[PDB]
DNA sequence: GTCTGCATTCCTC
DNA sequence: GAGGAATGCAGAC
């Protein structure tokens, strides 16, 4: 037998990897249960002809925010031991168990939409940081999902990322020698018959079969070279789709990208470099100090990198002396030693970012700008970072005494200090009338950070966490309603709500966290064989019962009522393809109920339950508690009314399964 | 309060 | 109009 571990942000992310495996593996025997209170497992017996295989996958829901926050040891430490110095967490880490220790097989991130603008690079720090470790990084994204006007659920025009973002994965793979890729899955809202923007999309770009093939070959310790080349080719076809749909005058053409991909030229030595310049756009309200004159100096010498208006460009070594002279004259830099450092004979990448909002809080999208530059040009390129947004007094003080202390506590400063050779600030200081100018020679510090790794040590996460919390409530709720209780229907979660009626599945995508009167439920369960009408049970999970907010029960029902007011995003016949939603659903065709789930170690009296029902308005309370000897989840269902009591009686009678080991549970009533 | 994930409006060319 | 610049809320701590 071989054992694998799936460490994920939550149970749903863990299960998404299992769905990928099960899509290609047709198992002869499947068993589910728990290895510990926190860790569910799936055991499979399958064959490749005459060759049988016995695999077990142990799931670890919820990552630590330090070394012993939830789990006894942090699986993420294996990434920082190989150079992942940014505070970045993928969605899933798959490991192999061998000689009492875990070995990382791959890191996987799931995205529900191909994001555009600066949202495309907001989390590029993950791909950069994990990518430099040698462990494969797979970024899976749905192509396409529409952005909505939340007041009427009407679709906004499709937006696509700059071709440089999908390209950055390919160039980071070439620079590091590791497998870093962007893979695309067909979204339910991919409807080329209705949207002209998708006229030239190549459907061979979709990678569902190839991702499952890759994962299974990795689990089998087989050669993945050819599967990796097919996936890299699809990532390149996406760059081609995007670059052929943008204007050539201020952006790289596909022939330019192709000449970099095939190794004819480097991104900084393209013969056509300079046909467009680097022209940073700065809002007039963001201007202060000498920022406008610095931007004029950059535009006097720069050559464009991928796009004229991306926040970075190049100053070729042939123009670096004159660029440095103009900067030094503008800011009165006279120190001979400093000027010599600035005038090193090499190409210079200039990145300009506001960095901070009017109160001094950091810009999230700016965190991925230097990682994007490093993925495109290499982390060893010389980078000059210019910042012009407002700094709080505490920030400028740390810059003047210990910049690494500031990098340690803030993710944006960590990005800047790890990847910049020179940091130039021309910033307003909150509470003061005029700007501060700083020129930081960060070369030595950058070099040391690029060699930093955490303590070398083997890891085998203990399946018993420090204590049981919200992640554990969700794992327990999900397992009972997905594998034990008979209802087939997909139900709902944060990524969308599916409702099955007749022989059709109706789905609402792009769910907002809240509506005018509703709150998005953590789980939605559909039960069809209890009443004449289908039952929709909306559940909110919390660590403790007092965490259940006032009117949360009423808010869960109102959220479902909000979705019923609109035509579902998509629909399909369960027997037959996804189409855009055509018919509206009817709320009276369903019974709606709400539930609050939490952990309680027998601290609630009859009066406490009466008060929780009054505060929340829930129809059902699900009190969960672990028993340690022997390990069991003890479940207490408290119905507020007769409809909820019928549901409880149904759950109790149907608490049987051929796949799931129900012996790990005890349903009090 | 600070940090980070999420995602929508604003503004330049 | 295209698309990058710029922005704040929320949850956990
Ligand atoms: Ca065989
Ligand atoms: Ca919850
Ligand atoms: Cl194409």
Give the helices and strands, then pairings.
Layout (H helix, E strand, L loop, with lengths): L1 E7 L2 H14 L4 E6 L5 E9 L2 E11 L15 H4 L11 E7 L2 E11 L12 H8 L5 E7 L4 E2 L4 E2 L8 H13 L3 E7 L21 H12 L5 H19 L10 H8 L29 H11 L1 E2 L7 E4 L1 H15 L4 H7 L5 E6 L15 H9 L4 E6 L5 H7 L3 H7 L1 H9 L2 E6 L8 E6 L1 H7 L20 H15 L7 E2 L2 E6 L2 E5 L14 E5 L7 E7 L10 H13 L5 E4 L5 E2 L10 E9 L6 H11 L3 E9 L2 E9 L2 H12 L11 E3 L2
Helix pairs in contact: 1-5, 3-11, 4-6, 4-11, 5-6, 8-9, 13-14
The structure holds calcium ion (2 copies) and chloride ion.
The structure holds a DNA duplex (13 and 13 nucleotides).
- What is the count of helical runs? 19
Main sheet summary: 8 strands, mixed
Q: Ligands in the structure?
A: calcium ion, chloride ion
Strand tally, please?
27
Strand content: 15-25%
Distance between the termini: 38 Å
- Overall geometry comes to globular
Binding site for Ca(2+) 2: 91, 109-110, 493
Keywords: Calcium, Metal-binding
Binding site for Ca(2+) 3: 470, 522
Binding site for Ca(2+) 4: 470, 522, 541
